[PDB]
């Protein structure tokens, strides 16, 4: 979601949404809205190298950085890895992987795992929500799998209920009956439902054949699921 931020005097006074029909349509998450305050809590202010006691102490960059310079020249290629975060900027990943290029350190681990049967990283489209949130409104039928949209995309949940108040189409949860604001058909769990629908034998899947402009949602949390493949 896009944002107009009312900072003042080098301090962030408040957050406001910046409207965009493709995304927020000027209704950002209430959780994001009060997020700014957390920037004001504890912060990595100074470098903190462990001492001989194994306790960290405040340190100049020359120290810690010459030290990690002393470590990372040792273990090129194998025996090194990089734990990417969930909020982290792509650029640091670019430079860091490039660092791992120079030493040919292939490791590139990242927080959430994503299954890749036939390697789905290549097609890029695989993990993409290929239909836009703006594109959801034209759908004449929509389905969801696993995690409720609101606890990942409350905005998108509002888009759903808005379509439900307007465009009129079926939606139903799979794997849980989580308390969504709009009506949704109850359904059991994956092993049966996915196959009964894949077969098209499932009456709900018969409704899926019945209606055009399909959409098929998956909670990305279910991409893991150990055997979520």
């Amino acid at each position: 979601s896009n944002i107009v931020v009312s900072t003042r005097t080098g301090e962030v006074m408040r957050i406001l949404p910046r409207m965009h029909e493709d995304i927020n349509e000027e209704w950002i998450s209430d959780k994001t809205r009060f997020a700014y305050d957390g920037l004001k809590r504890q912060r990595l202010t100074e470098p903190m190298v462990r001492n001989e006691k194994g306790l960290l102490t405040y340190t100049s960059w020359e120290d810690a950085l010459s030290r990690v310079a002393g470590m990372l020249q040792s273990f090129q290629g194998k025996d090194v890895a990089a734990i990417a975060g969930g909020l982290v900027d792509a650029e640091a990943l670019v430079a860091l992987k490039d660092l791992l290029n120079r030493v040919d350190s292939d490791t590139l681990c990242t927080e959430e795992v994503f299954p890749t049967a036939g390697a789905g990283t290549d097609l890029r489209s695989n993990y993409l929500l290929n239909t836009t949130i703006a594109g959801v409104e034209e759908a004449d039928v929509v389905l969801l799998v696993g995690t409720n949209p609101r606890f990942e995309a409350p905005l998108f949940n509002a888009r759903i209920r808005k379509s439900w108040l307007h465009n009129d189409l079926k939606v139903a949860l799979i794997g849980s009956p989580v308390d969504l604001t709009y009506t949704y058909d109850h359904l059991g769990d994956s092993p049966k439902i996915l196959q009964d629908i894949a077969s098209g034998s499932h009456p709900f899947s018969q409704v899926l054949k019945e209606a055009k402009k399909p959409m098929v949602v998956l909670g990305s949390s279910a991409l893991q699921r150990n055997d979520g493949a």
Binding site: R41, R43, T45, E46, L55, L56
Partner: protein, 71 residues
């Protein structure tokens, strides 16, 4: 004396020398609220008493707490 100056006058009489008021405070003593000063300390730029401007409104980011535990 031999160091007399301004600010030696009390604020009521300070109003009186400037003749903002024809009537000396004698006749019309002022409100005398609880929080106003009484001795009247006059201007003091030198000597140990001395105004000091300083930072106000505490802190900002609150720098992160270092661990106390070894390892």
């Amino acid at each position: 004396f031999w160091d007399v100056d301004g600010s030696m006058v009390p604020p009521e009489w300070h109003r009186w020398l400037h003749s903002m008021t024809d009537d000396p405070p004698t006749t019309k003593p002022l409100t005398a609220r609880k929080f106003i000063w009484t001795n009247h300390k006059f201007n003091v730029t030198g000597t140990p008493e001395q105004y000091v401007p300083y930072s106000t409104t505490r802190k900002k980011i609150q720098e992160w707490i270092p661990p106390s535990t070894p390892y």
